[PDB]
Design a protein around this ligand. Structure first.
Ligand SMILES: Nc1ncnc2c1ncn2[C@@H]1O[C@H](COP(=O)(O)OP(=O)(O)O)[C@@H](O)[C@H]1O
Ligand SMILES: Nc1ncnc2c1ncn2[C@@H]1O[C@H](COP(=O)(O)OP(=O)(O)O)[C@@H](O)[C@H]1O
Ligand SMILES: Nc1ncnc2c1ncn2[C@@H]1O[C@H](COP(=O)(O)OP(=O)(O)O)[C@@H](O)[C@H]1O
Lengths: 445, 211, 435, 442
């Protein structure tokens, strides 16, 4: 319940057939047939998993559907496959180098799968009996653990007592024990003993008493990225670095060791390699050093499939003094396959507007949708998409359910485009601050 | 310092060194900002931020704890909640090298493997001598018979904060300045007191305060 | 007594129930269309369904953009979060600027939790613990002026009692839910056990021992984000003295944000929490670099993004971090496609006069008619802000000569003593050595 | 199996005392470059020269990185190899001089041999034996500790020092656990519990490891391989200590620090001392820096200094630029982007571009490594397209062709598949031509 309606929340998957043939309007996506077919080919390359380190580039004019294509590929990838979506401005850090940030982004997009068997004994503790020997080296124990339906008695060991006297349980607490591994957790205290101690305390919490069978079997599959293993193996307590970001330039030797022993786990048969996709939106503002590191970082076996999106033409590359296509050097473009996206026509704009109004729970008339389509052909698509949401509130203020042409016209009058704002700035230039800092504040000449 | 000096069958010498600089604080800021009372919400917000909305809580986030225990190899699933809510110096002091299970994602680096072998190793071993550059450099240049060249000019205790009319402020400052756990950690226990505690009182060695 | 600072005569947008604006209402004069558009955006924020809505209000200086953003904040109310910001504040020496923009994004999404406060306070009459070297429980007796009440307690709160050095005869404070223990002091009934003592003696509480109260707690997502991402460790309840290492800001990972999101969602589904999205307002958006402008595009596409309001007073101006990008309002063309632009108009003479009269009556000053026309003529000739800043020295000069009203001579004297930018520039140009 | 832009190349392909043949080891052509790189390989195996630089230069898509990995495969997996990009030297933690020095020391390896005499096995008895005459004021005056060990096809009872009993209490060793006793130090450590005692209790944690194989007494020769950088970073950090500074810093961020020349000098002299005893052996390796035009002139000056060292490895540089200003300067036009001071201290290896037949052969071997079947006409069209646009673009469009062939349920790639893949995915020239004739900010 922590999700609101985003810019493209209607797109849930890539609308392709079993022959990788795109439908005209299915699964949230409209048009873009060749780009969707190529993205399906890339999807099958990730789903095969026998390829490694391939860079694709999605190039097109603005408001064409490149990040829509990335969102569709992400939704059709399925779960338990890593997908890292970064922007180009995120890799310039104060306490991390660009090369190390790119390495962390590369290793966040490839993970391994571990399956483990759990036998949980979760119940409420009734009574613990401790028997101590004369020497005191080893102790035996009795644990009477109770669910709603069933109560039994177990024999504990010496390390069981040593792990139980830490995080002290006190005959009425809900705990759970793993039989195969010996894992211990204290879930809290039962609600049946909530009126005994009259004041809670800082470290207590009240949970419900579990029901059913005491011994339960359940399998769990964990997918762990290579970056998480890097962070864990770089410090004494490294999970705080997973949740705080203070990893701080992990050395290369532990990464080489982790690569070797991930390979030996794959050879034994305990873990399996799950490749993924890294998406860099707005790749044109990366440095030339980042481009060289991207060029040589794709030739490793533990490298994901990298998707890049650019809306730039022949423009300057940052860190240099020359101009290049897509803002990218030719060495990076030689290691790439380019997906080209193309501008829409009136019918596709109308279909996208109808889908966005349906997703936003707005009812439009036919004339209102035609006027919004005409505005979306003259102006861009996002202006009409925003006009839907403000015209809905304009219509609601009039005590009307469906929007009309008058509400769309009032929203067009109250909110301006880029072109009308350009004209209105250009014809009143003296009331604005120019490049030289000049302004005419007063109204009387 | 301003301390307790004399203006001239035993004598008492008690520690009384203070700082001449005094920072004066009104009672209202203490009582309405740091201490809980009926008209403020210090303890409620503390519980909400630290226990209820903590993401290492096994009562609400059991899957994250199980994932982290497969990652790290911790035998207990309440270890991360305990680590995330204790200060760093206390975490340094009561850290115990308990056993961890083998079926985990944590490893032994070759640097740690080189470190662990030469912990008790004697001289004239090849690994031991390759890992002991600093002690050989200490004993070659005669560094236990050198003289001190620098001493500081001024030594000064921390700035004393006073609040007029409050015993709670004095107890809190005395607890912070003379914390028994860290003060015991930076010192040691006398040997006859260790004998009296171990033998005459039956306190085991593992129950001794860390020193 | 009362302070006035450039606003606070602005109380709201001053609209009716149909969204139309009166000419003078709520401290606003003029500007019908911008106020109507701001009311529409306020209703869209109140609808609580949309994420990533961005509105840029643009116009010249001293035209009313900051007053409109403030009036949006007053129309929303104190429950809705409002995070005002200037564009220069995103540059820090501790973390990257995109991280700071992410904290400011998550500071605009709030939560409401319904809690209770349960407090026992009084003088301790009995403190008897019983074992089975481990204590089982402790029974504590508390006394006030309205009676006595006995309580059973767990060993943890007994350890907290032992930490605070509580004996028989001390007035203590116990909160039931958290287990916090505070020692108020010893009681006046034991004030004569010695002639001189180091203890403070407080009286008995005049009310009951047990007190119950229902409270409301307001937090944001950034508070939970920084509560769960403390690198040094959890802090104690009372700390006059600092930590051993200085904790600095760190790049909070997206994994911690995902875990905080799922915990907040699971608490929302149980009816414990209510989600209140709010407004992030960024004044002087022309100060932003192109890297922050590029990160804003992917930041506005999140599912938990707030409503972003931007303001700018530039025209066809180059963008910071570039060399040959000329763009309107100093905003790049990639983000102006995601925006809705609201225009803000310059003022006329009678609007200036009504603004001056409103600022005079909020500042508790009386002005004559002729002084008002001279102040209006000065505002049209120099600046609107010049007359509003000259209103108070006129009042001081009138108070010096024992008068309760501002007369033309006070206005002329204040104009003689204080200059504007134009006359100061005129002195600057016809000068020899640096004025 | 995962393939990534390489791994069809195993070695160089030279015969003994001779020239390179045309196709061997995955290489098609580049005969003179392979011969020079083989001479460099024998120079590295000679283990005599120190601080030699080789820069191999040519245009893009020619085989410089391939020759570097071929050198690494021909040397073997025991000679150290440090691949590197010139962009990686810029760090925000230490200066780039120290990053280059760390990468320098990471390419020199040490071969250390050692003999360990060890006792291990299940504990059968563990008794401290009292002395004949006890001393007053104490309890438990021990003269020796009798510990009995049991393993597979063996059992032996030992007589130990009394000072092993405190380590017995320290490691919490009882009867039934399997332990690990090394000769000179004593210093027992508990491996675990035996598997024969696994099911005495329903709930327990002590892990259960199997009973060890072989006799309880064994002398094994272990060979442990480390680099000189590992010795430096092990000696620099303080060892296992009880002070608050060490355990305080173990829980903090491991920040890189400026290791001094003093520590490297003491490490070098103790390494030389044990090499002169015959215990150790030094194995120099290869440090490979790719795209050396990204390096600043200060790093070039440090390379000029650092190539003069006694312990330095061989260093291989690769560049694709022609006449380019050196970074950090405004007016130095230099060949390959390398300043003339470094250029005077190296040999230059020329790598030449390919032809139609070589492009066709490279496409064929990349196809059969990827486990794909390509027809003759599709191979000729792919070779023609590789000549027309790029060899890399022809290699990039093999797996889309395989996926589009498997979509129509075929195991063969034909002409219409490569035509559809060419229509779906563009190259650099066609995208540039689309950019040049469009005015929608494309
Ligand atoms: N083929 C499409 N189908 C559905 N929606 C689309 C399509 N193309 C673009 N859109 C919509 O247009 C809006 C803006 O397009 P976007 O993908 O952000 O442009 P760009 O590719 O330049 O980033 C998004 O809300 C997206 O949902
Ligand atoms: N329409 C208005 N009605 C009344 N007062 C106004 C109006 N517009 C601006 N003001 C006042 O004028 C002053 C300057 O306006 P401000 O909002 O700072 O201009 P800007 O749009 O340049 O930020 C403020 O103190 C504000 O209270
Ligand atoms: N002589 C060769 N024989 C076989 N494959 C080659 C040869 N030269 C280059 N390649 C292949 O061409 C691809 C790109 O060449 P690469 O070595 O990256 O060029 P560069 O010299 O610019 O680094 C590599 O995947 C490599 O396998």
């Amino acid at each position: 319940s922590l999700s609101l309606i985003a810019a493209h929340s209607h797109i849930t998957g890539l609308g392709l057939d079993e022959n990788l043939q795109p439908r005209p309007t299915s699964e949230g996506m409209v048009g873009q047939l060749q780009a969707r077919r190529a993205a399906g080919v890339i999807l099958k390359m990730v789903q095969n998993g026998t390829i490694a380190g391939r860079a694709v580039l999605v190039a097109g004019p603005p408001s064409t559907g490149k990040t829509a294509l990335a969102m569709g590929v992400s939704q059709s990838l399925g779960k338990d496959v890593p997908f890292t979506a970064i922007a180009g401005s995120e890799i310039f850090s104060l306490e991390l180098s660009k090369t190390e940030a790119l390495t962390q982004a590369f290793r966040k997009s490839i993970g391994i799968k571990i399956k483990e068997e759990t036998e949980l004994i979760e119940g409420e503790v009734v009574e613990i009996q401790i028997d101590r020997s004369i020497t005191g080296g080893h102790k035996q124990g009795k644990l009477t653990i109770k669910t709603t339906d069933m109560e039994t008695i177990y024999e504990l060991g010496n390390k069981m007592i040593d792990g139980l006297t830490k995080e002290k349980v006190l005959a009425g607490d809900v705990i759970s024990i793993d039989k195969a591994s010996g894992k211990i957790t204290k879930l809290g205290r039962s609600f049946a003993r909530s009126r005994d101690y009259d004041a809670m305390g800082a470290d207590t919490r009240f949970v419900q008493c579990p029901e059913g069978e005491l011994q339960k079997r359940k399998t769990v599959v964990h997918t762990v990225s290579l970056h998480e293993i890097d962070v864990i193996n770089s410090r004494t307590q490294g999970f705080l670095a997973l949740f705080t970001g203070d990893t701080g330039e992990i050395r290369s030797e532990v990464r080489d060791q982790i690569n070797t022993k991930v390979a030996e786990w794959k050879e034994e048969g305990k873990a399996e390699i799950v490749p993924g996709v890294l998406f860099i939106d707005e790749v044109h503002m990366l440095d030339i050093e980042c481009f060289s590191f991207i060029n040589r970082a794709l030739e490793d076996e533990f490298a994901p499939i990298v998707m890049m999106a650019t809306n730039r033409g022949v423009s300057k590359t940052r860190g240099t003094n020359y101009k290049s296509p897509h803002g990218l050097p030719l060495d990076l473009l030689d290691r790439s396959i380019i997906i080209t996206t193309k501008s829409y026509n009136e019918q596709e704009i109308k279909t996208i507007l109808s889908i966005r109004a349906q997703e936003e729970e707005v009812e439009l008339s036919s004339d209102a949708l035609d006027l919004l389509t005409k505005t979306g052909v003259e102006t861009s698509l996002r202006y009409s998409s925003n006009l839907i949401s403000v015209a809905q509130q304009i219509a609601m203020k009039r005590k009307n359910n469906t929007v009309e042409v008058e509400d769309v016209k009032r929203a067009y009058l109250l909110f301006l485009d880029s072109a009308r704002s350009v004209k209105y700035v250009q014809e009143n230039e003296s009331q604005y601050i120019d490049d030289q800092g000049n302004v005419q504040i007063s109204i009387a000449k | 310092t301003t301390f307790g000096k004399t203006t001239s069958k035993f004598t008492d010498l008690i520690y009384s060194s203070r700082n001449p600089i005094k920072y004066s604080l009104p009672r209202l800021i203490y009582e309405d900002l740091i201490l809980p009372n009926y008209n403020n919400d210090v303890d409620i917000a503390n519980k909400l931020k630290n226990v209820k909305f903590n993401i290492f809580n096994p009562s609400t986030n059991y899957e994250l704890c199980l994932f982290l225990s497969k990652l790290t190899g911790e035998p207990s699933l309440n270890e991360f909640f305990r680590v995330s809510t204790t200060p760093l110096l206390k975490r340094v002091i009561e850290r115990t090298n308990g056993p961890k299970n083998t079926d985990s994602l944590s490893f032994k680096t070759i640097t740690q493997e080189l470190l662990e072998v030469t912990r008790n190793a004697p001289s004239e071993g090849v690994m031991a001598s390759l890992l002991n550059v600093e002690k050989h450099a200490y004993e070659r240049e005669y560094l236990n018979c050198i003289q001190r060249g620098y001493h500081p000019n001024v030594s000064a205790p921390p700035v004393t904060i006073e609040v007029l009319g409050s015993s709670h402020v004095t107890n809190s400052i005395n607890n912070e300045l003379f914390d028994p756990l860290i003060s015991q950690a930076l010192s040691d226990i006398p040997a006859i007191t260790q004998y009296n505690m171990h033998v005459k009182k039956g306190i085991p060695v593992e129950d001794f305060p860390k020193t | 007594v009362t302070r006035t600072a450039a606003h606070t005569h602005i109380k709201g947008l001053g609209l009716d129930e149909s969204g139309v604006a009166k000419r003078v209402e709520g401290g606003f004069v003029g500007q019908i269309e911008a106020r109507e558009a701001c009311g529409v955006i306020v209703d869209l924020i109140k609808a609580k369904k949309m994420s990533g809505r961005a509105i840029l209000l643009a116009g010249g200086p001293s035209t009313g953009k900051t007053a409109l953003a403030l009036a949006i904040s007053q129309e929303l109310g104190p429950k809705v979060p409002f995070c005002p910001l200037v564009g220069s504040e995103l540059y820090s020496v501790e973390v990257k600027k995109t991280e700071t923009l992410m904290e400011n994004f998550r500071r605009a999404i709030g939560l409401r939790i319904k809690e209770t406060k349960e407090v026992y306070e009084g003088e301790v009459t009995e403190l008897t613990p019983e074992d089975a070297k481990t204590i089982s429980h402790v029974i504590v007796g508390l006394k006030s002026a309205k009676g006595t009440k006995t309580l059973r307690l767990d060993p943890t709160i007994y350890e907290s009692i032992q930490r605070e050095k509580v004996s028989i005869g001390d007035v203590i404070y116990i909160e039931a839910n958290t287990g916090a223990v505070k020692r108020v002091g010893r009681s006046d009934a034991y004030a004569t056990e010695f002639d001189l003592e180091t203890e403070e003696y407080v009286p008995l509480p005049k009310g009951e021992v047990h007190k119950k109260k229902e409270i409301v707690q307001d937090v944001t997502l950034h508070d939970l984000d920084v509560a769960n991402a403390r690198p040094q460790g959890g802090q104690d309840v009372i700390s006059m003295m600092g930590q051993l290492l200085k904790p600095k800001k760190t790049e909070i990972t997206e994994k911690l944000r995902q875990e905080v999101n799922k915990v907040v969602a699971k608490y929302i589904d149980q009816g414990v929490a209510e989600l209140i999205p709010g407004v992030l307002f960024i004044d002087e958006v022309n100060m932003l670099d192109i890297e922050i402008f590029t990160y804003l595009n992917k930041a506005l596409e999140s599912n938990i993004a707030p409503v972003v309001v931007l303001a700018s007073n530039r025209g066809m101006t180059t963008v910071r971090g570039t060399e040959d990008v000329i763009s309107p309002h100093g905003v790049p063309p990639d983000l102006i496609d995601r925006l809705l632009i609201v225009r803000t108009l310059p003022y006329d003479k009678d609007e200036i006069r009504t603004i001056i009269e409103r600022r005079a009556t909020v500042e508790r000053l009386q002005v004559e008619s002729s002084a008002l026309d001279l102040l209006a003529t000065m505002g049209t000739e120099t600046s609107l802000r010049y007359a509003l800043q000259l209103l108070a020295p006129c009042g001081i000069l009138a108070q010096t000569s024992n008068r309760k009203e501002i007369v033309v001579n006070d206005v002329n004297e204040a104009k003689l003593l204080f200059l504007d930018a134009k006359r100061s520039t005129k002195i600057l140009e016809t000068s020899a050595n640096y004025l």
